[PDB]
Design a protein around this ligand. Structure first.
Ligand code: HEM
Ligand code: HEM
Ligand SMILES: CN[C@@H](C)Cc1cc(C#N)cc(OCc2ccc3c(C)cc(N)nc3c2)c1
Ligand SMILES: CN[C@@H](C)Cc1cc(C#N)cc(OCc2ccc3c(C)cc(N)nc3c2)c1
Ligand SMILES: C[C@H](O)[C@H](O)[C@H]1CNc2nc(N)[nH]c(=O)c2N1
Ligand SMILES: C[C@H](O)[C@H](O)[C@H]1CNc2nc(N)[nH]c(=O)c2N1
Ligand SMILES: [Zn+2]
Lengths: 414, 411
């Protein structure tokens, strides 16, 4: 209960009706008496009996999408998978199923504002991979293809699935391209403070760090449960953008740059009960991700103060909104720079307007669209974007991208 | 089951929530569906006494006299009043305790660090709209205090058989009128166009200006509501001007000093107070972001950006964002210069983080709606963005209720 749930937009009064929520799979963390919608994470292998029903649910869904439900091919496929599970305790997805499942894990990502693009996703099948060097090769081809000389194209590379859990493939990097952070003996931090831990691990694994402010990190790659291995990404594959400002000539003097390709590589892709622990995917940036969070978080590069000083701002009282003012200019500079270098990027106004349109269409064609308001609303100027006033329902559909523990906590070193 | 941790991801501070286990009202969410962004997820004597007992229990627990002679006596007193009269009346102390804790339990309010500095005016002896007018005038005058605003609530008689409700039909004691123009646009505040028409329907003579203070529309004891004009000397207003942009005053914007929400229902120990206007002071973004820049509101971004001579052809110039900051700078500067109490979203969110820490320490938790606590501009550079919160509904509480004109049958 109940079969229908309505959502309202308070700016346009448009009302949508959600039926899709009935296919919700996992719990949210919420209950009837408490809501955990702003908890970041409100959360060995699957057995045979656990697995048939999960496999059947996905196979049914797949044949339902290609308008072949209850067909000979549908029934044959079910028998094939069931027997494979019974004799091998797992099964293998057909290429078509893998591609469908990957696109739908994105489509089901309630925290992603970018989902209007979900069906155009290049899927690279890397399930024949056996070694870290091969992971490196696949990852390089992913980066080059996705980057496309600035004209970014979303893609995902999927490595072999978990078997017994002692042979996992993992990208130890949280993103394929990130900058190193170095904590200094005086307590201060050079580079990106978000990445200090991973940096220290790379250095321990033998990485010789240049110890600069924007040193691209090496790939740390684990195949088939083996100790991970370091590889330098070829610099010519790493597209970068110097941040300048269209009016403040001094902004370049800050010496800021960022990388063009956002590629998240530490999440788990779940399809019909199968677990792909290495599945790096990439899109293009929303400006705020760099300009608000990456640059202006106190736990990040934290340049608000420095920018505001160069803007001659009164910085003694907060009620002057010097931070707010600085933040806007910084995000203006980010968008300007990317646009000027013909590197794909979306501003938070465009993106949120697109998501609203995507959401409504999803309600029309699919009977709903799970969305996480806390993550969908941009980290600046929320109420002047249309998502702010839009009621949303959040729930877990499958296939899905999931969080997984950092590998260095679980790895049994050889 | 279980204590629950919330984590601040900026400071890594972790608080342990136990208070949620005393929650008894539902949130709207389920195991499988979160509804945290739905605005509103949708008595006889038999139901009343347990509700009453629960409130009395926690009251005497608050004054450290649980199980006392007076406590048990109060219980036998309330029970006897309920089967006799099908209701019961709160002691003055219980009323004060009740009102403050309804503020304290308000998940959506970032101003709760002030919750126990609340001036309670008991207006349960009121019988007429004229009496209601008088109580309200005294509230406004006391709360405004010449710009040094003071928090207050005025509580009118509780609901009885539901046919004799007291209602303030205004959504705030002080609001500006909104008029549906001949060309289909809107003069004044567009959020109030319906209420404004209702007042005109009752005989209000509209100045049909941009910032016309609406009359009070007051319903006593289930009777038809009556119009009253607030004496203008009680209505503190601020001309909005900019510290650097001299042309900003030429926009001709003003706002009122006193935010006084008057359309909610106060629930204490099973008793329903359908008229209970409460007031505090403004966080600047309430006016500068919402009242002024919401598309369904005054919507002045366009005009301001023009005066700032910004590039407005493409959205990726963040011209809306720039104009928004300036408007909010103007609002804070204007109130401050006129010595009218106001708080900015940086200072307000700081205070709330400190308030959370207090409540976890002394109360074992604090219900908080991240969706409403995070300010509508500059979210992630305020400390509440990075603050995990748990949301649950404690009682006493403020509740939503229907607009009286959807319910009321005239005579
Ligand atoms: C194509 C352009 C895309 C844009 C503009 C975009 C935008 C965003 C943004 C702004 C976030 C919030 C990020 C944060 O605050 O950390 C997000 C989250 C997310 N995105 Fe997208 N994204 C894009 C592509 C993709 C693709 C291709 C996938 C998967 C195939 C994807 C999957 C996800 C997931 C799973 C999350 C949430 C991660 C979590 O649960 O913490 N996105 N996206
Ligand atoms: C003293 C200064 C106060 C400040 C700065 C403040 C701030 C705020 C803000 C910014 C909101 C969000 C409003 C919106 O965006 O519509 C809010 C909501 C709320 N406030 Fe406060 N507040 C204050 C005092 C009070 C008082 C005195 C009461 C009652 C005793 C109160 C009860 C509430 C309630 C019940 C809500 C949520 C209403 C809803 O559920 O829609 N607040 N507050
Ligand atoms: C500082 N807080 C972050 C660490 C939270 C976060 C964690 C993880 C994980 N694991 C994954 C996350 O993914 C966000 C994300 C994922 C994919 C994106 C793509 C493909 C494109 C894009 N522009 N942004 C993305 C943003 C975020
Ligand atoms: C446009 N969205 C609003 C209509 C949502 C809203 C509804 C109601 C009701 N009923 C009551 C609301 O009250 C918000 C509120 C309540 C009290 C406040 C006090 C006492 C002070 C202050 N500065 N802001 C307040 C803000 C809001
Ligand atoms: C505490 C809070 O839930 C947490 O900081 C969330 C809030 N919303 C967010 N939204 C986005 N897009 N990204 C984030 O990292 C976060 N962080
Ligand atoms: C749909 C959504 O819940 C609604 O627009 C909320 C979002 N957060 C808000 N937060 C505050 N403070 N005030 C509001 O009116 C709203 N509106
Ligand atoms: Zn919830």
């Amino acid at each position: 209960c109940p079969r229908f749930l309505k959502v309202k937009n308070w700016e346009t009064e448009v009302v949508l009706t959600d039926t899709l929520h009935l296919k919700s799979t996992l719990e949210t963390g919420c209950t009837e008496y408490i809501c955990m919608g702003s908890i970041m994470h409100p959360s060995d292998v699957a057995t045979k009996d656990q697995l048939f029903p999960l496999a059947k649910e996905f196979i049914d869904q797949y044949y339902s999408s290609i308008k072949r439900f209850g067909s000979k091919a549908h029934m044959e496929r079910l028998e094939e998978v069931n027997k494979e599970i019974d004799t091998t305790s797992t099964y293998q997805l057909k290429d078509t199923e893998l591609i469908y499942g990957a696109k739908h894990a994105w489509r089901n990502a309630s925290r992603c504002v970018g989902r209007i693009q979900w069906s155009k996703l290049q899927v690279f099948d890397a399930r024949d991979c056996t070694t870290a060097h091969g992971m490196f090769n696949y990852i390089c081809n992913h980066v080059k293809y996705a980057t496309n000389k600035g004209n970014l194209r979303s893609a995902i590379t999927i490595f072999p699935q978990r078997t017994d859990g002692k042979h996992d493939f993992r990208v130890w990097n949280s993103q394929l391209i990130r900058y190193a952070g170095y904590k200094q003996p005086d307590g201060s931090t050079l580079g990106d403070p978000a990445n200090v831990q991973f940096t220290e691990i790379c250095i321990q694994q033998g990485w010789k760090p240049p110890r600069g402010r924007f040193d691209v990190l090496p790939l740390l790659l684990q195949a088939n449960g083996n100790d991970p291995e370091l590889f330098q990404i070829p610099p010519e594959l790493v597209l970068e953008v110097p941040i300048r400002h269209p009016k403040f000539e001094w902004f370049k003097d800050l010496g800021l740059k960022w990388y063009g390709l956002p590629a998240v590589s530490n999440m788990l892709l779940e399809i019909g009960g199968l677990e792909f622990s290495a599945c790096p995917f990439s899109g293009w940036y929303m400006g705020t991700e760099i300009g608000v969070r990456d640059y202006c978080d106190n736990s990040r590069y934290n340049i608000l103060e420095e920018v505001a000083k160069k803007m001659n701002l009164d910085m003694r009282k907060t009620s002057s909104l010097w931070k707010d003012q600085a933040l806007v200019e910084i995000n203006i500079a980010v968008l300007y720079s990317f646009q000027s270098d013909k590197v794909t990027i979306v501003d938070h106004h465009s993106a949120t307007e697109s998501f609203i349109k995507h959401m409504e269409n999803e309600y029309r064609c699919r009977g709903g669209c799970p969305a996480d308001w806390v993550w969908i609303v941009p980290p600046m100027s929320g109420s002047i974007t249309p998502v702010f006033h839009q009621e949303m329902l959040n729930y877990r559909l499958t296939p899905s991208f999931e969080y997984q523990p950092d590998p260095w906590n679980t790895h049994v070193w050889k």
